[PDB]
Amino acid sequence: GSMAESELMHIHSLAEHYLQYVLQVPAFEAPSQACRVLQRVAFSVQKEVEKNLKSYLDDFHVESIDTARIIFNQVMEKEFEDGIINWGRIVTIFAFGGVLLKKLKQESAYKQVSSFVAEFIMNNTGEWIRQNGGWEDGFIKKFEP
Amino acid sequence: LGSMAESELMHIHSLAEHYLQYVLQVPAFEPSQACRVLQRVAFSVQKEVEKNLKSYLDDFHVESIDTARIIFNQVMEKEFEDGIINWGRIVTIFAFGGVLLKKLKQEQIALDVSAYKQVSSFVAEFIMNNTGEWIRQNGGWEDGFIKKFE
Amino acid sequence: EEWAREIGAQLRRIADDLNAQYE
Amino acid sequence: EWAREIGAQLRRIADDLNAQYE
Ligand SMILES: [Cl-]
Ligand SMILES: [Cl-]
């Protein structure tokens, strides 16, 4: 396989496991350490977003995956428009996907959200991740310690 | 005529004093809507700074008013070095003055019950000298600032 | 889309605050 | 140094705050 394939699949796994955690549905059997720190850090960001941006989020009625996709795309475009990447920003990608998944559930969402989250992370930050020590080294060292 | 800039400075200084009094919970002798808005938005920023830049704030010690003034000017000079001004940046001037004042209260060697008055002075000077004209050109505190954040 | 600029700004702020909190 | 990093973050915070209130 290619480095691109392995990177995307790893990102997708991370997205999936985070969103499963947001849905509070158990999964059968090997949480990596990157999964565990992402769970902690992304969920705390997600709670902060849901509190700080409550007035914006209550304005959205996410009645379809398409609406969720567009909201995600537009917000992410603004967030990353300055061309800067860091681990905090990568965490917020996961967190905002979880915010939108929760809203969808109330207003397979899991499959589709994990996919568009993974694609955005790969396409906009995949090379940066590679260059900054990857998930099981750079990422965990950043948020531990 | 001969008082426009004097009035502007005194108004800026009043806002700075009332913000710093709010930070330390010192009852003011004289609040306007501009003060209320500034107190909300700037205090939000101050808490954000104290929470998220702790590791940098821990890198210095504010043992005197002289040190506070130097640190304030250094940080502010860096923030505004790109020559850009907006209301968000003006908010951060007040907010960082508050951050430093809190540090000074904890770290100052000499007894100084008037510390907040001295900090309000150098905060006001910075605002006037670097953003005073921009403030006048951008609606002032009522038509500009309040409308921005309300 | 004003919401995209405004939410995007707040999320960037949150992100970069988190980045700084961890050095 | 710490002064340049704090100034840089304050600028980022300020500009994000500014952009939040269009
Ligand atoms: Cl996959
Ligand atoms: Cl502005």
Side-chain angles (χ1 to χ4, degrees), chain A residues 60-62 64-104 107:
Chain A
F60 297 126
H61 287 258
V62 190
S64 64
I65 295 145
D66 279 356
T67 300
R69 198 189 300 281
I70 286 164
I71 293 170
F72 178 82
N73 289 344
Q74 288 208 195
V75 171
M76 290 296 100
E77 177 174 344
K78 159 66 162 159
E79 186 176 349
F80 287 88
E81 74 182 354
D82 65 3
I84 294 168
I85 304 168
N86 61 52
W87 285 120
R89 292 182 180 208
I90 290 162
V91 169
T92 58
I93 306 177
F94 290 104
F96 196 61
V99 170
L100 291 173
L101 217 209
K102 290 212 75 177
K103 293 204 79 220
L104 265 167
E107 296 139 19

Side-chain angles (χ1 to χ4, degrees), chain B residues 45 48 51-53 56, chain C residues 13 17-18 20-21:
Chain B
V45 172
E48 178 190 14
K51 174 166 165 51
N52 294 297
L53 296 181
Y56 298 121
Chain C
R13 186 169 169 198
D17 282 348
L18 179 65
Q21 186 180 203

Side-chain angles (χ1 to χ4, degrees), chain B residues 23-24 43 46 50 97-105:
Chain B
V23 170
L24 299 186
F43 196 60
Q46 173 160 350
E50 292 165 347
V99 172
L100 280 179
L101 174 60
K102 285 177 76 181
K103 261 207 160 277
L104 180 67
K105 295 320 293 183

Side-chain angles (χ1 to χ4, degrees), chain A residues 1-46 48-50 52-62 64-104 107-111 113-129 131-145:
Chain A
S2 71
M3 248 157 70
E5 290 163 328
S6 46
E7 291 173 10
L8 177 59
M9 291 187 297
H10 280 131
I11 286 161
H12 193 210
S13 289
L14 285 161
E16 287 172 330
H17 297 312
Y18 180 67
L19 293 179
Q20 293 166 16
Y21 178 75
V22 174
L23 294 164
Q24 294 291 287
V25 181
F28 188 99
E29 285 180 16
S32 73
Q33 228 280 335
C35 289
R36 259 168 294 161
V37 354
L38 180 65
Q39 184 173 302
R40 172 170 59 85
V41 180
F43 199 67
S44 78
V45 166
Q46 170 160 346
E48 169 160 5
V49 170
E50 289 168 351
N52 294 358
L53 284 162
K54 187 181 180 278
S55 60
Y56 288 94
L57 299 167
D58 286 353
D59 284 328
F60 297 126
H61 287 258
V62 190
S64 64
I65 295 145
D66 279 356
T67 300
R69 198 189 300 281
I70 286 164
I71 293 170
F72 178 82
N73 289 344
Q74 288 208 195
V75 171
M76 290 296 100
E77 177 174 344
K78 159 66 162 159
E79 186 176 349
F80 287 88
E81 74 182 354
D82 65 3
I84 294 168
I85 304 168
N86 61 52
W87 285 120
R89 292 182 180 208
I90 290 162
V91 169
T92 58
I93 306 177
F94 290 104
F96 196 61
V99 170
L100 291 173
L101 217 209
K102 290 212 75 177
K103 293 204 79 220
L104 265 167
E107 296 139 19
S108 166
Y110 157 78
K111 170 169 185 311
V113 179
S114 74
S115 170
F116 74 61
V117 168
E119 292 170 344
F120 185 91
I121 295 174
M122 176 64 188
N123 296 171
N124 293 279
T125 72
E127 190 62 15
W128 187 93
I129 291 163
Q131 291 166 331
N132 284 277
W135 295 107
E136 310 300 335
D137 183 351
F139 178 66
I140 68 171
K141 290 185 177 172
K142 171 69 182 170
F143 291 113
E144 300 182 329

Side-chain angles (χ1 to χ4, degrees), chain C residues 1-22:
Chain C
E1 210 203 58
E2 179 183 2
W3 52 258
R5 287 186 297 268
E6 287 180 355
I7 297 172
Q10 186 141 22
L11 290 195
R12 192 201 289 184
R13 186 169 169 198
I14 287 168
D16 291 344
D17 282 348
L18 179 65
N19 191 55
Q21 186 180 203
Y22 287 87

